């Protein structure tokens, strides 16, 4: 009743860093470990049941 | 004048999930709880009927 | 009363200066930024056009 | 020269999906994303300009 939706195109954009080679070549390998692996969690890690 | 009528005391709360941290001392715990984080509850499983 | 139109979107933005930093990163870290006193812009003479 | 790349890179990267599909409720977008040979990106930017 009234409304109709039609999007035309999807476009990717992202904010990269103009990375300094002097450190980034080490920093890329620094992340490349079993040890250095970064974990994320919510403030409220809640399980929902309806 | 008085119509002898009585006032109805109440409270209203909206837009707030009411949290209970599982600890015996609920305050400032979050993750590593007192009661529901004990190594005792890692051994076996128990059902919850409310 | 259904009529046809094409919108005009425009930004308002007053009372702040158009500030851009002077580094290869292009981010003001401290007072003197990277390109401010680097290898290319240090003692030599150069003349800004627009 | 640390934390500043004296060399040409890009900050914002644009690329449109090779196959887009319009259907009943969903609207798929599949594309090949490749980060530069020595670049990083924290995934809080990566959006869709619809």
């Amino acid at each position: 009743d009234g409304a109709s939706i039609k999007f035309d195109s999807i476009c990717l954009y992202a904010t990269f860093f103009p990375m300094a080679h002097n450190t980034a070549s080490t920093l890329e390998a620094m992340l490349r470990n079993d040890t250095n692996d970064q974990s994320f969690n919510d403030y409220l890690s809640a399980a929902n049941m309806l | 004048t008085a119509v002898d009528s009585i006032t109805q005391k109440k409270f209203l709360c909206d837009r707030t999930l009411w949290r209970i941290p599982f600890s015996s001392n609920f305050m400032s715990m979050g993750a590593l709880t007192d009661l529901g984080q004990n190594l005792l509850y890692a051994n076996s499983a128990h059902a919850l009927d409310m | 009363t259904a009529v046809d139109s094409i919108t005009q979107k425009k930004f308002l933005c007053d009372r702040t200066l158009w500030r851009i930093p002077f580094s290869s990163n292009f981010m003001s870290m401290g007072a003197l930024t990277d390109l401010g006193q680097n290898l290319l812009y240090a003692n030599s003479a150069h003349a800004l056009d627009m | 020269h640390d934390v500043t790349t004296d060399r040409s890179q890009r900050l914002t990267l644009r690329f449109i999906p090779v196959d887009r599909e319009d259907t009943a409720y969903s609207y798929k977008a599949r594309f090949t994303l490749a980060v530069g040979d020595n670049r990083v990106l924290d995934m809080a930017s990566t959006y869709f300009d619809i």
Binding site: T23, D42, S45 | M29, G30 | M29, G30 | -
Partner: peptide, 24 residues
Amino acid sequence: FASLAPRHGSRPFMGNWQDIGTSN
């Protein structure tokens, strides 16, 4: 690295950091 940041008073980088976890 000690070279990596721009620091105040002739010192590269100075005060170390700590960020808090979500639950609490």
